Amino acid sequence: SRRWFHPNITGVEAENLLLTRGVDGSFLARPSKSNPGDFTLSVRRNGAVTHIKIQNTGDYYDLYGGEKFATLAELVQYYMEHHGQLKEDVIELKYPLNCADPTSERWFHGHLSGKEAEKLLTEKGKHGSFLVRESQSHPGDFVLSVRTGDDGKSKVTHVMIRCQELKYDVGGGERFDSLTDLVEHYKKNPMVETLGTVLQLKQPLNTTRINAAEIESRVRELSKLQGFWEEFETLQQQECKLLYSRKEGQRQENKNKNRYKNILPFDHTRVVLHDVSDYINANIIMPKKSYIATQGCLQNTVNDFWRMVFQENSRVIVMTTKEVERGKSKCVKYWPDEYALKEYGVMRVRNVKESAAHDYTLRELKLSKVGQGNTERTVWQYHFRTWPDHGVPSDPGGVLDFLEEVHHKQESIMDAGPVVVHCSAGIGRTGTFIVIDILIDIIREKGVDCDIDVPKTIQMVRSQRSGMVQTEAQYRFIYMAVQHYIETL
Ligand SMILES: CNc1nccc(-c2n[nH]c3nc(N4CCC(C)(N)CC4)cnc23)c1Cl
Numbered sequence: 001s002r003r004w005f006h007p008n009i010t011g012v013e014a015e016n017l018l019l020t021r022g023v024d025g026s027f028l029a030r031p032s033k034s035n036p037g038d039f040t041l042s043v044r045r046n047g048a049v050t051h052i053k054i055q056n057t058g059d060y061y062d063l064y065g066g067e068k069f070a071t072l073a074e075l076v077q078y079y080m081e082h083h084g085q086l087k088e089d090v091i092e093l094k095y096p097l098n099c100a101d102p103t104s105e106r107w108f109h110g111h112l113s114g115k116e117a118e119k120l121l122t123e124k125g126k127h128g129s130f131l132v133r134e135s136q137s138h139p140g141d142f143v144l145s146v147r148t149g150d151d152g153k154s155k156v157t158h159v160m161i162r163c164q165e166l167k168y169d170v171g172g173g174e175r176f177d178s179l180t181d182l183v184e185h186y187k188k189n190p191m192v193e194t195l196g197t198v199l200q201l202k203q204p205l206n207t208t209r210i211n212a213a214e215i216e217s218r219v220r221e222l223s224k225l226q227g228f229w230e231e232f233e234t235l236q237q238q239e240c241k242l243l244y245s246r247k248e249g250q251r252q253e254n255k256n257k258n259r260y261k262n263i264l265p266f267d268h269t270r271v272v273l274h275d276v277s278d279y280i281n282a283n284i285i286m287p288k289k290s291y292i293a294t295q296g297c298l299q300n301t302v303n304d305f306w307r308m309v310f311q312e313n314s315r316v317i318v319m320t321t322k323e324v325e326r327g328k329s330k331c332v333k334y335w336p337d338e339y340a341l342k343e344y345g346v347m348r349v350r351n352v353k354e355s356a357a358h359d360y361t362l363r364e365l366k367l368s369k370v371g372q373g374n375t376e377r378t379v380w381q382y383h384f385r386t387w388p389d390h391g392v393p394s395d396p397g398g399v400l401d402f403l404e405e406v407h408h409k410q411e412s413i414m415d416a417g418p419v420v421v422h423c424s425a426g427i428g429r430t431g432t433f434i435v436i437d438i439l440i441d442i443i444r445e446k447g448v449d450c451d452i453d454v455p456k457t458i459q460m461v462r463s464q465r466s467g468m469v470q471t472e473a474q475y476r477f478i479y480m481a482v483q484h485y486i487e488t489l
Contacts, residue, residue, distance in 0.1 A: 001240040002073060003180075004096035005029045007104055007233050011040070011051070017097060018044045025094025029054075029072060037471045039072065043091050050091065057390045058471050059330075059428045060263060068260045070427050070467030073240045078262060100178035102132070103230065104237040107183065107204035109133050114143065114158075120205055121147045121156050128202025132179060138162065142179065144170070146199045157199055159191065209453040212443050215483050222479070232472045235455045242462055244268060254279040257304070259295045263425050269464045273307050280304045281426070283465040284418060287438040287457075289410060292418040293465045295426040296321060296331030303345035305334055309379060310347060310367060313417035316410050317381040320433055321423040325389055330424035335365060335381060346370050349379075359386040359398035362405075380409050387429065392473050396481035400488075403437050407444075431468030435461055436481045448486060454478060 006014070009030050018026050022044045032038040032053070039054040041063070053064045054075070060068040061075055066086055069075035079086050079093045086093070102108040109117075112133040121129060125147045135141035144159035159170055161182065167175040168182045170191070176182040183201065191199040208231060210218045222228040248254065249264030258264060258281050265271070271282040271292060280301065282294035292312060297305045309317070321330045336342040341350040348368045355362040361383045368376040382405070386398050393399065410419055419437075423429040435458055442450055458475075461468045469475060 002237050003098035004076065005072065005104075005237070006099045006101065007031060008101055009099075014040070014042045014051075015049045018042060018049050019047075022097050023095065025092050026097045027093050027095070028097045028099070029076070036473065043093060045091065050088065052086070052091070056471055058392070058474060059423070060260065060425045060467070060470065067262050068425070070263050070425070071239045071242075072236075073243060074262070074466060077243060098178075100180075102179040104234045105132075105180060105183075105204075106207075106234055106238070107131050108179065109207070114145075117143075117145050118156055121145055122154075124209075125156075125205055126203075127154070128200045129205045130199075130201045130203075131205045132161070132183065135160075142168070144199075146201065148197055148199065157193075157197070159199065206453070208455050209451055212450045212452045212482070212486055213448045215452070215479075215486055219479055219483050228476060228479075229472065231455060232475045235458060235475075238459060239462065239467075242459075242466070244463075246466070248279060249281065251279075253277075257281060257298065257301050259298055260425055263295070263427065263466065266465060271308055271312070273304065273311060275307065275311065277304070280308050282308060285434055285461055285464050285468075287441070287460075289441065290418040291434050291437070292420045293426050293430045293434060293468070294420065294422045296329075296422055296424045297334040299332045302332060302334045303347070306344045306347040306349065306367065309420060310369065310375075312420075313377075313415070314420050315377060315379055315413045315416040316406060316419045317379060318406055318419060318421040318433060319381065319383045319423075320387060320421070320429040322385060325424070331422070335363060338363075343370065358401075360384045360402050382406050382409075392432075392477040396477065396484045399433070399436070400440075400481060400485055403433070403440065407437070407441070427465060427467040428470040428474065431458075431461065431465075431470065432474040432477060435469060435478055439478070439482050440485055443482070443486065448489065452482065454482075 006028050014028060014030055024044055027043040030040050032040045037056040041052040041054055043050050055062045061072060062068050063075060083092055107130055109131050113136055117133055127149050130146045133143050135143055140163050142161040144161055145156060147156050149155060161168055161170055167177060168179055169175040187201040190201060244266045246264040246266060248267050248270060249258060255261055257279055265281055265283045269283045271280055271284055272278050273280060282292055285291040285293050323329060323331050323333055336349055336351045338351050338354040346369055348370055350366040352364045352366055363381040365379045365381055366376050367379045384402055410416055421430045421433055438457055439452055458469050
C-alpha cells in the first residue's frame with residue numbers, strides 16, 4: 001500500500017523504471033515539479049508509457065481525463081476496482097511498481113547520529129519506540145534503535161543493518177530489497193535476543209510533537225533550503241491507512257446529492273438525517289467543540305442542508321468559498337438576501353442583517369421550521385471571501401481574526417451544536433480552517449508551553465473525512481497561522 005508513489009524520481013527515471021522493471025499494466029505516481037501541486041500517473045501500455053496529469057490547486061485531486069478525488073490512494077483504488085473508466089482506450093492499472101525510497105517513512109531519520117538517537121529514545125520514547133538512521137561508522141549501512149521496558153527497567157537496544165548489493169539485512173537470515181521491507185518484516189515477527197527480550201516494533205519515535213512556545217524555531221527548521229516537504233510527504237504516505245468504507249454515498253439513490261461523485265463521506269462518521277432520506281455529503285469532525293465538514297450546497301441539496309443545520313442544532317456557519325470561482329459554481333446561494341425571507345422545504349430562513357467586514361461578510365439568519373413557529377434560532381453565517389483562487393493567502397491575519405470572531409460567537413451560544421464549515425468539495429479549505437481552529441483552541445485553553453502536533457492532528461481529522469488539508473501550501477499555512485497566533489500574545 002502506497003508503495004507506488006515515488007517522491008524523488010524524474011520523468012526520465014519513471015519511464016526507465018516502467019520499461020526495465022515493469023510489464024504491461026505496471027504504474028507509478030510521482031510529484032510533477034513543474035507546477036507546485038501537480039502529480040503524474042505513469043502507466044505502461046503496449047510497451048510504451050503514458051502519463052496522465054493530476055492537478056491539485058487546493059480543492060481536490062483533478063485527474064485530467066478522469067474524475068476528481070480526495071486523495072491519491074482513493075484515486076488508485078477507484079481504478080483498480082473499476083477497469084473501464086480511465087481511457088486515453090482503457091488504461092488498466094494492474095501492478096504497482098513499488099518504491100524503495102525510505103524518505104516518506106515515519107521511522108526513518110536520515111542524517112541522525114547515534115548519541116542524539118539515544119537521547120530522543122530515552123526522553124520522548126516508550127516501550128516499542130523505534131527509529132532507523134544512517135550509519136556514521138559504515139557509510140551505506142544503517143542502525144535500528146528500539147526501546148524496551150515499562151531506574152533500569154528500560155533500555156535501548158541497537159541493531160546494525162548493512163546494505164550489500166542493493167539488499168538489506170540484520171546480519172543473518174533473509175536479505176530484503178528495501179529498508180521498509182525489512183522494517184515491515186520485523187514489525188510482524190520481531191527479533192528475539194539470546195536471554196529472552198524481544199525487540200518489539202510498535203510506534204515510530206515521535207519527531208513532530210513540539211512545544212507551542214518555541215514554534216518559531218521549528219518553522220526555521222522546516223524552512224531552510226526540504227523539511228516542510230519531508231514532514232508533509234510522510235503524512236501523505238499514511239493516507240492508505242484511511243481507506244474507510246464510503247458505500248452510503250455510492251448508492252444509486254444518493255449519486256446526484258454529491259457535487260463530485262467520488263468525494264464521499266465516510267460511513268462511520270457521516271451526518272445521518274433522521275426525521276425520509278438520510279444522506280447528506282457531510283461528516284462530523286471531532287478533535288469541547290465539534291465541527292461539520294460538508295461540500296458546497298447543490299441546488300438539489302439545499303433543503304437537505306438546512307435539515308442538517310436544524311437537526312445538529314448548529315448556530316454558526318463558516319463559508320470559505322465564493323458561489324462561483326473561475327468558471328463553475330463552487331456553492332449555491334442557500335441564504336435569502338438581506339431583509340428577505342425564504343422557505344427551504346419545511347425550513348424557513350430570514351436574513352436579518354448583513355454585517356460586511358474586511359475579510360468576510362457576517363449574516364445573521366433566523367432559522368425556523370414551518371408550523372409551530374417558535375422553532376426560531378439564530379444561525380450566524382460567516383462568509384470568508386479574501387481567499388485566493390489558487391494557493392493560500394500570503395498573511396494568516398485575515399483568517400486568524402475570522403476564526404477568533406467565529407470562536408466567540410460559538411462560545412457565546414451555550415447550546416450550539418457543531419460549527420458548519422464548508423467550501424466546494426469540503427476537504428481543502430474546510431480542512432485547513434478546521435485544523436487551525438483545533439490547534440488554536442489547544443493553545444487557547446492550555447496556554448503556551450503546551451504540546452502541539454500538527455501532522456498527528458491532520459491525520460486524526462483525515463480519519464473522519466477523506467483528504468482534509470489538500471496541499472503542502474495549506475500545510476505550510478497551518479504552521480504559519482499558528483506561529484503568527486503565538487507571537488501575537
Ligand atoms: C498516525 N499518523 C501520524 N501521527 C503522528 C505524526 C505523523 C507524521 N506525519 N509526518 C511526519 N514526519 C516525521 N519525521 C520527519 C520526516 C522523516 C525525517 N522522514 C521522518 C520523521 C515524524 N512523524 C510524522 C503521522 Cl503520519
